[PDB]
Symmetry: C5
């Protein structure tokens, strides 16, 4: 447990843990300065960074001990936080007339995506490409729903700050989340060892997690602020 | 204490701990966005997940050490959380005219159920079937009370969101709680060759606890939300 | 530090710690749903279970390590919580016209009781009967004050919910607190060789503490609720 | 790590830690029941006991390990808490027309007192009497300021609850704080090693800290209560 | 891991950790006593000391173990806190008409400064002078912006308490932050091994961090207080 200056994975575990901890405090402590109608979207942004702060604490210590970070262990957090992130689409479009049907659809797709991903990574690596494909289809459905589907139509109808927030969240989902499917292909045996594979993603995962989770919440927080100051 | 990808019991202890921790924060931090009349029901939903989060933390570490999870140690949480869950029937029917008599009845039955279950599991395994039977009868009385008894009549009279919440809670008690008596029969010596093989009761306990406890609370939280927005 | 199913002392340390922790959260989180005039009585009920939760955490660990629970170590909590419980008589009768004189009397007697008890148990066991007797007399004075003295007269004048609460608290002090003088006589050398056999003092301490501390607070909480509802 | 019944220093570390922890909770959780104008004085009372609770936790564990409590290590808390206590004179006299000049004077004297004391105790024990003397003079100036100086005149002009609180705080500073200079003379080599040298102050420090810190805050809390209730 | 009276680095780690912890509690608990328009600037002052408290806890323990404090490890906190400090210029000038452009500029410069500094210190020490120079230029740009640039013009236009706060913060940036570039030159190989090099900065870092972070926040808190009191 002596620290080394060249351990960049180590460094990014320490930073990521501290940034998520601070983000969780910022969202929980800000909630009361807003009208009740915004509070839930902010609270959930804080839950997302709270789960990640606590799991990053454990992973940071484990890396200090063993100098390993098994990818399957990252799913402890992803299986909870990715559905919560998908629920934020419902929370920000509820005013624009989203119905619980939307919430259930998103929760279902996100959970299928993460559980099939875990089966590919941990339970049945023989059939990792097949599990990948099931995960990939759930991802594609989520992307289609928010870029073109009902969620997009609701955002467009609302216009204003909401539409703006919606569009930014859609970029985070399209571009920010793409690192995870890529690392899956890099780390699992399949037909994609030719292209990817043998790539160290730990630094990318540690920085990506923080940007993905804190960025999502800052966009939601920014929406509450814009709306309130009008 | 390296993590292994095939340790599914391990994985479900880490997930269950994080989900209960997050649920506790969600209910505690939501309480203030509601009129005083709902806050106690929500507070108690948070107490239920808080006790479970803290006990799941200990059990998760113990499994990391010894790769054992003795059933009797789960009763540390059940003896506190199952009575609190039974109290939620009183809290949601208090408006409909439930009297403390109902609260005391439910607390008494739930406590008898859990303590007789612990005597069967830990103190007197020779007579596990007899202790089972006493627990079984307490369970049956609770089920009859909420499906057909006074509590059901109060719910029906109130109608509306309350009746809806009541019925959902009755399904959780009937179907969601059935895993516990089944695991008891699977694990104890008696007249019962409850052979539910292929699945590790530990995985079922870890997933079932989270669903049972967070599900109960989300139904109560949903009732506060429905009522408030009317 | 493997758990054993027959370690009932172990079990009751785990339960007592969790119950106190939950009770502390319940009283601290309830405080704000009450008019200012009730909040202090509730806050102090929470302090009582908070001190006990944290000390039960240490005692639980120590029992896991050494399988010993020295009685003198329980006094770490009792010297703080028993005076706080005695202050609750002042807080609930302040409306009925109790004066700080009463508060100081109760604090003084409770502190004398606990400190003389500790001298008998830990510093001067040669003269345990004498220290016992000094503690005994302080106990008797407290009992006489609340059952017959000024405090009783104030309660009786107030009538209503207050008198009801006062009488229940008087039973907890008379009957619930009797286990402590009994265990003292059971554990110390003197003119008393009280057998009180069959049952492990540690189990009785662990269950008695939780009932004594949470019961006291639930009676104070019940008084605030009754009063608020009218 | 086993506890001994005759370890009175040990016992007083456990009690002191628990009492400061409970006091911190009491002041932080009471703050919201008061008009804004009192909240800062109460918050600072909680900071004082919060710092001490956390440092008492470390010193308690260190004593369990090594059975030593080096006096210089107590200064970790004193260098922060003694200036905060001195600021409380400004906070309670701000209404009576105290100016920031007074705050800065008290902060400066308190910090000089504690830092010169630390130099005498830890960095330059050869000249402990000289450092003593510098600390001694800063103490005397503080005492003169509050008993006779401007601060006293402000209190006297205000009259009422303020004057009462001021006088009680002046007794705590004069008599309650005298233990610290005495222990310095008892523990340092100088011209005073005959009179005071060779005295075990650990029990006195542990009890005195708790009484000094919780006492100061209870006087401030009592001032807020008196003022509010009329 | 016995404590030594001559370990001044050790002492300052313990003090710094406690002071940051106390400052965090002071800012988080004060937030609610202010109109909404000030609360964010105070919350962020608390995040700054919260990150530092938690990182100082880890560094304190590591020094207890190994008696080393690698400079690169301090960047775990600096990469988060220095940008938050720069955002405070935006938060205090938002009323005077600062635009998000200013926020982004400051965040960008602060992050470049800290990341280039870390490259010089940890990844590429061969070219530490060059990385130094890039960091140095980002620093100079920040200084020019706040002393002469747009931010200064906004402050000057606002006048009053804001201008006063602005000027104080500009001194902290100019003089209080200068210790960090100096320590960099003292610790790295370059052309400045003649001027600096061979200097122990640990005591200076530990005291400077506390003064820099708590000082910044006390100036922001002072601005909210002055403004509130009209
Ligand atoms: C240590 C020591 C010493 C100290 C000795 C000490 C302090 C001994 C303390 C003994 C105590 C406290 C015994 C308590 C025994 C409780 C009884 C019998 C209770 C009856 C209760 C009824 C009959 C309720 C009837 C209730 C009714 C009808 C209805 C409603 C009630 O509300 C309820 C809730 C109970 O239903 C000495 C010996 C001095 C010196 C030595 O040298 C050393
Ligand atoms: C790293 C590196 C590089 C860069 C390193 C860098 C940028 C280092 C920067 C160091 C700085 C900026 C030091 C600044 C020192 C300011 C002073 C002393 C100012 C004093 C003022 C006084 C003593 C009185 C003023 C008196 C009054 C009354 C004024 C103010 C008062 O305090 C008050 C607040 C009361 O008004 C380079 C070299 C580029 C490449 C290399 O390769 C490596
Ligand atoms: C895993 C797996 C499977 C599934 C794998 C899956 C789903 C992989 C998915 C990969 C994805 C989604 C890649 C996406 C790449 C998007 C790009 C490069 C876009 C760039 C654009 C940029 C860098 C910026 C800017 C662009 C614009 C327009 C900027 C706009 C501005 O930023 C503003 C916000 C202002 O508009 C399969 C293969 C099925 C089976 C296998 O067996 C296993
Ligand atoms: C321990 C022990 C003892 C005690 C043991 C005990 C009490 C064991 C209890 C086992 C229980 C309660 C099992 C329950 C099984 C319910 C079933 C299969 C029903 C399933 C599923 C339907 C009905 C779905 C759907 C139906 C509909 C209407 C749609 C339902 C949906 O779900 C809806 C959305 C409406 O909710 C004894 C034996 C006494 C002594 C021994 O010595 C040991
Ligand atoms: C460091 C050092 C140095 C200095 C060390 C220093 C300055 C030590 C100073 C110690 C002090 C000032 C001790 C004072 C002791 C006062 C007493 C006991 C007075 C009792 C009076 C009662 C009992 C009446 C009244 C009331 C009481 C107790 C309580 C309450 C009130 O009656 C009330 C009405 C409020 O209840 C020097 C020597 C400079 C160099 C050396 O080389 C080293
Ligand atoms: C906070 C963490 C986040 C946003 C993680 C997101 C992860 C994904 C969207 C993962 C997606 C996957 C697929 C679409 C294909 C292969 C399996 C997964 C789970 C890596
Ligand atoms: C949060 C945990 C929950 C809802 C646990 C519930 C446990 C039961 C309902 C257990 C019931 C039992 C019987 C009715 C028979 C055998 C003994 C028990 C205790 C397992
Ligand atoms: C939460 C803990 C409680 C209520 C403990 C109470 C303890 C006592 C009432 C102890 C009484 C004693 C005597 C009356 C005589 C012997 C010594 C004592 C301290 C056990
Ligand atoms: C919470 C801790 C408190 C109130 C401690 C206060 C300590 C002092 C007032 C110590 C004073 C000293 C001198 C006046 C002379 C010798 C050196 C000191 C630091 C022991
Ligand atoms: C809370 C900690 C603070 C305010 C730290 C600030 C650090 C700097 C302003 C560091 C600046 C540097 C340079 C300008 C050049 C050399 C490298 C750095 C990163 C030390
Ligand atoms: C005071 C308000 C805080 C809001 C919630 C804080 C998040 C806590 C996360 C804990 C992360 C563990 C990191 C500590 C490493 C020792
Ligand atoms: C370890 C890296 C920490 C990174 C934390 C900050 C990430 C911020 C992402 C960008 C948020 C912008 C959304 C604001 C609305 C326009
Ligand atoms: C709403 C959040 C849903 C969270 C889903 C968690 C799934 C837990 C993983 C399942 C692991 C079981 C492995 C069994 C393989 C034989
Ligand atoms: C400031 C808001 C935070 C609220 C946290 C809710 C209580 C959660 C406590 C449960 C902790 C046990 C799990 C920790 C595993 C290391
Ligand atoms: C809400 C009420 C909770 C009740 C908690 C009951 C736990 C009691 C377990 C009893 C253990 C002692 C058995 C010893 C038999 C020899
Ligand atoms: C280890 C598994 C963790 C699983 C997470 C549980 C989420 C809880 C979902 C329960 C169903 C919600 C019903 C609400 C009805 C309005
Ligand atoms: C987070 C909810 C607010 C009030 C919480 C007070 C709980 C008291 C904590 C007691 C901790 C000791 C038990 C933990 C066992 C590991
Ligand atoms: C060893 C664990 C025991 C758990 C104790 C929790 C129950 C508290 C006792 C309840 C007393 C009820 C009196 C309330 C009157 C309104
Ligand atoms: C108002 C609460 C008061 C708490 C009193 C605690 C005192 C602790 C016992 C003192 C131990 C003295 C050591 C014996 C020396 C022979
Ligand atoms: C707002 C009216 C309150 C009257 C307060 C009188 C008694 C206060 C209770 C004392 C609790 C102090 C906690 C000390 C921790 C050991
Ligand atoms: C609800 C506010 C809580 C008040 C702050 C409590 C201070 C906690 C300091 C830690 C000292 C307790 C010792 C723990 C031993 C394991
Ligand atoms: C280790 C000993 C524990 C000490 C317990 C703290 C109690 C101190 C309170 C004494 C001061 C009374 C304040 C007067 C209020 C007007
Ligand atoms: C009541 C609000 C408190 C917020 C501040 C918490 C900061 C905790 C970080 C430092 C942890 C303690 C340091 C040493 C513990 C052994
Ligand atoms: C080893 C660390 C000790 C540092 C103590 C922290 C307190 C520093 C406060 C700085 C004062 C700034 C005043 C600005 C107020 C307008
Ligand atoms: C609006 C743009 C959002 C895209 C954010 C992507 C961040 C992921 C980077 C992970 C590698 C360091
Ligand atoms: C270090 C801070 C990074 C991101 C800053 C927040 C940007 C948007 C905040 C919303 C303000 C209305
Ligand atoms: C609406 C019906 C709710 C009932 C759900 C039962 C919960 C199932 C427990 C899962 C065991 C793995
Ligand atoms: C309503 C009267 C309550 C007093 C009785 C409580 C005694 C239980 C504590 C001892 C259990 C071992
Ligand atoms: C305020 C209404 C009731 C107060 C008393 C409740 C008693 C609950 C006992 C809980 C045991 C788990
Ligand atoms: C009226 C206030 C006088 C306060 C004096 C208290 C003495 C504290 C030190 C005791 C150490 C055992
Ligand atoms: C152990 C309890 C000590 C409590 C000391 C009394 C507090 C008096 C405060 C008066 C405020 C109304
Ligand atoms: C008016 C503000 C001046 C800033 C003083 C700098 C504080 C840090 C000094 C370094 C500590 C040794």
């Amino acid at each position: 447990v002596r620290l080394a200056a060249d351990d960049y994975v180590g460094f990014t575990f320490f930073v990521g843990c501290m940034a998520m901890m601070a983000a969780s405090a910022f969202f929980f402590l800000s909630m009361s300065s807003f009208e009740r109608k915004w509070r839930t979207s902010i609270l959930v942004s804080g839950l997302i960074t709270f789960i990640a702060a606590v799991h990053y604490w454990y992973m940071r210590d484990y890396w200090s001990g063993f100098a390993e970070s098994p990818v399957f262990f990252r799913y402890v957090d992803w299986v909870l936080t990715v559905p919560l992130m998908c629920v934020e689409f419902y929370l920000i479009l509820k005013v624009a007339g989203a119905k619980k049907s939307l919430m259930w659809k998103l929760i279902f797709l996100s959970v299928v995506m993460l559980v099939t991903g875990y089966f590919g990574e941990a339970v049945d690596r023989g059939n990792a490409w097949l599990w990948g494909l099931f995960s990939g289809v759930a991802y594609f459905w989520i992307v289609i729903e928010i870029w073109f589907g009902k969620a997009k139509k609701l955002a467009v109808a609302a216009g204003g700050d909401v539409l703006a927030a919606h569009k930014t969240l859609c970029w985070f989902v399209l571009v920010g989340w793409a690192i995870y499917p890529i690392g899956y292909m890099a780390g699992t045996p399949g037909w994609y060892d030719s292209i990817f594979g043998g790539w160290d993603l730990n630094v990318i995962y540690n920085i990506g997690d923080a940007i993905n989770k804190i960025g999502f919440g800052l966009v939601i927080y920014n929406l509450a602020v814009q709306a309130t100051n009008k």
